[PDB]
Amino acid sequence: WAKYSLDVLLQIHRMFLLRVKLMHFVNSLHNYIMTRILHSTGLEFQHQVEEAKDLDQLIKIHYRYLSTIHDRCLLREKVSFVKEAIMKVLNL
Amino acid sequence: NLMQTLKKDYRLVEYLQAMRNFFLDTMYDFYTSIFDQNVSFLNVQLQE
Amino acid sequence: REIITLQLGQCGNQIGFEFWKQLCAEHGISPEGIVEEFATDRKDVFFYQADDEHYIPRAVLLDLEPRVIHSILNSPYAKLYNPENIYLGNNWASGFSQGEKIHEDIFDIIDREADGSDSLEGFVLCHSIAGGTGSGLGSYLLERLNDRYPKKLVQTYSVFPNQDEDVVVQPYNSLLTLKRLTQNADCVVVLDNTALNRIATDRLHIQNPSFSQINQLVSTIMSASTTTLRYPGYMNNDLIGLIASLIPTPRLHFLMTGYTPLTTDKTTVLDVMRRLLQPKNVMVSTNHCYIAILNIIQGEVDPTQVHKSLQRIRERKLANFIPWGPASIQVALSRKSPYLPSAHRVSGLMMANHTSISSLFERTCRQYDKLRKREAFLEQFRKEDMFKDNFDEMDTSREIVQQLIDEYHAATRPDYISWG
Amino acid sequence: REIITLQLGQCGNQIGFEFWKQLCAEHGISPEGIVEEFATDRKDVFFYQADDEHYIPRAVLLDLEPRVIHSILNSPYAKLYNPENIYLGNNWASGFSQGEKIHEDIFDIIDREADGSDSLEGFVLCHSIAGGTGSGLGSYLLERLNDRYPKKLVQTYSVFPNQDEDVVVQPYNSLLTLKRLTQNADCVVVLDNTALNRIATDRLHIQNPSFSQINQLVSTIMSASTTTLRYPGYMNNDLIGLIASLIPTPRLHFLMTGYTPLTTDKTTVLDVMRRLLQPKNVMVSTNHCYIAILNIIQGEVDPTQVHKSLQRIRERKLANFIPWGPASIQVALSRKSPYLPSAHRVSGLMMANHTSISSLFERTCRQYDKLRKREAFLEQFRKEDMFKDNFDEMDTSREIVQQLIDEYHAATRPDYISWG
């Protein structure tokens, strides 16, 4: 939502520097969130589940896949020092 | 044997592939149309 | 979404022909359009799912003094694309005036294909700057497209007119076309003919068939740039997202071309990153500093490799920075295409906004200024006189390109609260 | 750290060409620069990891009346090094004046390669004393380098102008160049042309191709001296550490060359130590006493051998001592290089500061004094007259070399609280 709001727009040329000043920040953050967590940790996780021959360990590797992506993209605690910053740059 | 016949019928990998595709190209287009609300409106846009 | 590609002039129809042949060989289609059995992809970006089970590309075929377009006619790739819209030089004024008198039905041709596709993302113009055939008509059609449709994107793949060259009106033609490019386009992709000529005479020992080999290069670059649209990723599955980061302001919309193998006729991301950042793996050849770079890689990429490669690129500082902000080289990953030759398995390309192209602009401006001061190289072309008896459009284009050079130099400064 | 090597003149480009060919054969690279599979080393001392997977050396190519440099051009080692900086005699005044008028862009060439490497340790000048082509331009560039960069090291590999020789201005040229060498250099490595000529006519029976064989000798010595920098040891992995011990004071910075095999076309450290200490295994041929000697050995060295060899060297007293202090022959051990020919498996070289070179200096001073007293051997060179109409630079150089001879003789004394 923040990326598309910053990428829909067609002063003088000065508005456009303000475009770069924010659009770069959200774009780099987007690249981080996908690649370094949700695809790196996903790529190791697949190679782990394709060698599970047990009912029991299959739940466990999955919970230990979500709970580390849920840590890396943090939502577990300290949402008053990380989450609020992302929320206010959404209002930006 | 049980894990083999769980990946030849009732494939967990299939539901896994669908899962992480129902967030993150296609779901971009769906939400950008909503940029320009209501809970029954979303059903009919989603099914489109 | 969907891209409608426009080709015009002999050089533009040449590069469009090789690009369509390249995408025909790339995707699973015959030269008739017959479906293959090996084809995460998309075949609806340049291709309409057309109505005889041939994925016929949406291409506007324009001819002006056709010689090579006749060879395009009797060809097996004329069964791939022909929606039957072919409708009929050595000057900008002649091509401009000829395009002016017949804008109606060719605009109807544009309207037909605009009604043809369900969605639209942009118009990609196969264009040659001061190519004679492409010149004038291309600038006039650029005015028609940007005026008639303000809601879409205009892309112009352009060459820089230096082929070690006789035409002395060529600086005037390139200056007027560049005025149109700065004012009537959203983004311009520019290449140098001399740079690709040097690279071609380097990698082989060819001297005479330089045109066709340059066509291979630009077609490979055009396929490589739209691979991220043709194959579904996460970003730049629309044109405007790739266009957005490199262009900080509506005046600096001219992009350098890079592609890290110059070869297709083991490797890691780290080596090809440091191999990309030199200005002699760039296919476009004081303080000169990039505004923004974007690189897209395609291959068997370990995801940790891009991470530590970008680490090395930071602490080495082998890229030219932007003063007024952060706007840096961005790592993008794309899928390796089916049925591409297996050399340079990890292969990347870059598009970058650099202030160094201002030097090439002012060189051509200096050539124009020389011939304009001498006043012996207008040649008294009759279309040039009848189009403008006062030749004030040359002065207006000179003013616009001077403002462009000043804005380039102002973006070079640490303050870009000082304009031009 | 990293060394940027400068070559100039026909003789200097000759010795740089053979040295680069020697290091190409030594390290695991092709004459194009293609990596080998056998290569504790370093390839970043003379070599940049350059940007087409060729370890291209940082070499400044300077030409002045090029004859052999044209042969260097059409060569397979022109694919190893060419950063494309070649820019254009028989006199010191002509080469000095020609270097004076164009110092700007060649200093920009120096600046380009100085920006090229990440770190820098020194500038090694391939130079020939009174070689005509190297002369004058080399002395002027020595002034430019030591003035422009006071934080780095300047090394000058130099020959002594005695080739059994017609040029009668040669003592004047060598005297002016020696003034520049004493005043504008941190260290000078000097060899005798007659000594290497005697050794070459000894080991073979060659009379005509003496130049090329002397080139083999100096290139082998230059590789042997920087083996301890190119291969990681414990000390003298920087130049200044090897430079430090031999040079006790800024005036005595001239070093003799030794290398214990004169052969490459069983052995122990003990025998090659006693074989090194004679003045006829020295390649540079009253009380004469060394200031300081340093020897570096490379081979299959038992570590007890250097210990008892140095015992024998002490109680035999086969080396000339220093009165005013301790500064003696130091044993250094280095790695045997890959792909070197397996003759003299234990091989050592020495660099030494000796007062015996004062004799060669005063011989050339006596030749200059003879031709200067006669006043018939300036030949009225026009560049010599226009450069200095009063010829007071010859008097200043004579004063400086006289102070040098006096400081040499004062260092010979047990008191060096008496100066000159």
UniProtKB/Swiss-Prot annotation, chain B:
Family under the similarity heading: Belongs to the TUBGCP family.
According to UniProt, the tissues expressing it are described as:
Widely expressed, with highest levels in heart and skeletal muscle and moderate levels in brain.
**Known partners and oligomeric status:** Component of the gamma-tubulin ring complex (gTuRC) consisting of TUBGCP2, TUBGCP3, TUBGCP4, TUBGCP5 and TUBGCP6 and gamma-tubulin TUBG1 or TUBG2. TUBGCP2, TUBGCP3, TUBGCP4, TUBGCP5 and TUBGCP6 assemble in a 5:5:2:1:1 stoichiometry; each is associated with a gamma-tubulin, thereby arranging 14 gamma-tubulins in a helical manner. Gamma-tubulin at the first position is blocked by TUBGCP3 at the last position, allowing 13 protafilaments to grow into a microtubule.
Spans traversing the lipid bilayer: none
Q: What is this protein called?
A: Gamma-tubulin complex component 5
The major lineage groups are: Eukaryota, Metazoa, Chordata, Craniata, Vertebrata
Outline what the protein does: Component of the gamma-tubulin ring complex (gTuRC) which mediates microtubule nucleation. The gTuRC regulates the minus-end nucleation of alpha-beta tubulin heterodimers that grow into microtubule protafilaments, a critical step in centrosome duplication and spindle formation.
Per the record, the domain of life is Eukaryota
- Compartments where found: Cytoplasm, Cytoskeleton, Microtubule organizing center, Centrosome
Curated annotation (Swiss-Prot), chains C, D:
Modifications the protein undergoes after translation, according to the UniProt entry? Phosphorylation at Ser-119 by BRSK1 regulates centrosome duplication, possibly by mediating relocation of gamma-tubulin and its associated proteins from the cytoplasm to the centrosome.
* Compartments where found: Cytoplasm, Cytoskeleton, Microtubule organizing center, Centrosome; Cytoplasm, Cytoskeleton, Spindle
Q: What is its main location?
A: cytoplasm
Q: Which disease is it linked to?
A: Cortical dysplasia, complex, with other brain malformations 4: A disorder of aberrant neuronal migration and disturbed axonal guidance. Clinical features include early-onset seizures, microcephaly, spastic tetraplegia, and various malformations of cortical development, such as agyria, posterior or frontal pachygyria, thick cortex, and subcortical band heterotopia and thin corpus callosum in some patients.
What GO CC terms are in its UniProt record?
apical part of cell; cell leading edge; centriole; centrosome; ciliary basal body; condensed nuclear chromosome; cytoplasm; cytoplasmic microtubule
As for what it does, the entry says: Tubulin is the major constituent of microtubules, protein filaments consisting of alpha- and beta-tubulin heterodimers. Gamma-tubulin is a key component of the gamma-tubulin ring complex (gTuRC) which mediates microtubule nucleation. The gTuRC regulates the minus-end nucleation of alpha-beta tubulin heterodimers that grow into microtubule protafilaments, a critical step in centrosome duplication and spindle formation.
**What keywords is this UniProt entry annotated with?**
Cytoplasm, Cytoskeleton, Disease variant, GTP-binding, Lissencephaly, Microtubule, Nucleotide-binding, Phosphoprotein
Residues bearing PTM Phosphoserine:
119
Impact noted for substituting residue 360 to P: In CDCBM4; the chaperonin-dependent folding and hence the yield of monomeric gamma-tubulin is compromised
**Which InterPro entries does the entry mention?**
Gamma_tubulin (IPR002454), Tub_FtsZ_C (IPR008280), Tubulin (IPR000217), Tubulin/FtsZ-like_C (IPR037103), Tubulin/FtsZ_2-layer-sand-dom (IPR018316), Tubulin/FtsZ_GTPase_sf (IPR036525), Tubulin_C (IPR023123), Tubulin_CS (IPR017975)
Can you name the source organism? Homo sapiens (Human)
Its transmembrane ranges are none
Under the heading PROSITE patterns, the entry gives: TUBULIN (PS00227)
Put simply, this protein is called Tubulin gamma-1 chain
UniProt xrefs under CDD domains: gamma_tubulin
Q: Name one GO biological process term.
A: microtubule cytoskeleton organization
